[PDB]
Design a protein around this ligand. Structure first.
Ligand SMILES: COC(=O)[C@H]1[C@H]2C[C@@H]3c4[nH]c5cc(OC)ccc5c4CCN3C[C@H]2C[C@@H](OC(=O)c2cc(OC)c(OC)c(OC)c2)[C@@H]1OC
Length: 387
């Protein structure tokens, strides 16, 4: 069980690291190779999220039939294929294919690893701690990703970060042989309430929408910032990923503080404050004209997003416990749908908005939306039960 937890933690870490390594590399690479680009990069970045969203229903149907280890190993293989294609491709179509494949492997590994964790551990006190440790590998991967890719892209070329990540994925796949023996076919049983029934509830809609908008505020920022940083003639040496580093660190700091402070303060008020701070900070991003000017707004963005998430995940758990037949994975299913929809709508519309009216107005619109959604958290002050 320790090895399974480590395997799932490392799988999520490598998935998010591969998702975030391309942020400083590909936009600058496609920007340089040219010398409508915004829309192309937006579609390239949103393809992974939309493919993962589409694939999610068809992975549960596979785990319900052949168990967890086979889709886990298939996810690892797809991750290695995507990593190699990222490493060696130099064309837009191949990069799009590599991004799309990452969605299939990410869905496979996330759904099957989380199910395996939620089913192996029988004691709910142990299961909660285990799933907290494993799900924390996503934010650690997001933190590690950008600076590593930026430094290796500046100093030892574009292929090196992806080759190193491919080696890590190979090591994880070799660990799978020692631990799981993916040839094992296992049964599975379905419990709880179907997701489509939960999404019909307006309160779960409020919480999921808050999370979706809070994370879309940076889903749009991921492909657009490395192109807007060309206004400062910014180099890649300790700059293109270190620009995103403060948000990654502040997310961890804010989650650590407010996962404790929210229960005392109130999760609805905590989420409302987080939404307001997110809006204000992404409004304050465009006015910076130096790399040192992005430290405060990115820190605010990460801190407030961590505040919103720490306030909203227990809120969703409490809501599904009150209103429907809850299971250990319902909160993760709702949050994953919210994240996928946010990261799919973000870049796709952000590219068009940036082309039409520019990046500062894109950030202004997103900040206004994130501020205006905050008052809807008042409906979560005391939600009633249903017959
Ligand atoms: C698509 O998403 C991700 O890439 C992950 C991150 C999303 C977002 C983010 N992206 C960035 C990209 C950057 O590029 C340079 C820089 C900074 C950021 C930040 C800072 C803010 N934030 C950090 C990451 C959050 C992660 O999600 C969880 O940690 C999580 C935890 C849970 O429980 C503890 C869950 O279960 C309820 C759960 O359910 C889905 C998810 C999420 O994985 C699903």
């Amino acid at each position: 069980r320790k090895l399974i937890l480590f395997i799932v933690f490392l799988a999520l870490l490598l998935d998010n690291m591969l998702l975030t390594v391309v942020v400083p590399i590909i936009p600058s690479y496609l920007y340089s190779i040219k010398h409508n680009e915004n829309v192309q990069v937006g579609l390239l970045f949103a393809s992974k999220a939309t493919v993962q969203l589409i694939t999610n229903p068809f992975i549960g149907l596979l785990t319900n039939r052949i168990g967890y280890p086979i889709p886990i190993f298939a996810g690892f293989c797809i991750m290695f294929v995507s990593t190699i294609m990222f490493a060696f491709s130099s064309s837009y179509a191949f990069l799009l294919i590599a991004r799309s494949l990452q969605g299939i492997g990410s869905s496979c590994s996330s759904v099957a690893g989380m199910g395996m964790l939620a089913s192996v551990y029988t004691d709910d006190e142990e299961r909660g701690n285990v799933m907290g440790i494993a799900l924390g590998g996503l934010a650690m991967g997001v933190l590690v990703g950008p600076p590593f890719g930026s430094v290796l892209y500046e100093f030892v070329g574009k292929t090196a970060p992806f080759l190193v990540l491919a080696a890590l994925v190979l090591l994880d796949g070799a660990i799978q042989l020692f631990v799981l023996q993916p040839s094992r076919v296992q049964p599975e049983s379905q419990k709880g309430t179907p997701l489509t029934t939960l999404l019909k509830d307006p309160y779960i809609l409020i919480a999921a929408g808050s999370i979706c908008f809070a994370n879309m505020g940076i889903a749009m920022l991921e492909p657009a910032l490395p192109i807007w940083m060309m206004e400062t003639m910014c180099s890649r040496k300790w700059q293109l990923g270190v620009a995103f580093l403060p948000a990654s660190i502040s997310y961890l700091i804010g989650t650590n503080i407010f996962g404790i402070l929210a229960h005392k303060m109130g999760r609805w008020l905590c989420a409302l404050l987080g939404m307001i701070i997110v809006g204000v900070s992404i409004l304050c991003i465009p006015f910076a004209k130096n790399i040192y000017g992005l430290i405060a707004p990115n820190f605010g963005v990460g801190f407030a997003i961590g505040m919103v998430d720490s306030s909203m995940m227990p809120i969703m758990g409490y809501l599904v416990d009150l209103r429907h037949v809850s299971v250990s994975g319902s909160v993760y299913a709702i949050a994953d749908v919210a994240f996928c929809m946010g990261y799919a709508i973000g870049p796709s519309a952000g590219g068009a908005i940036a082309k039409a009216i520019g990046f500062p107005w894109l950030m202004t619109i997103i900040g206004i939306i994130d501020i205006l959604f905050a008052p809807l958290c008042f409906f979560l002050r005391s939600p009633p039960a249903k017959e």
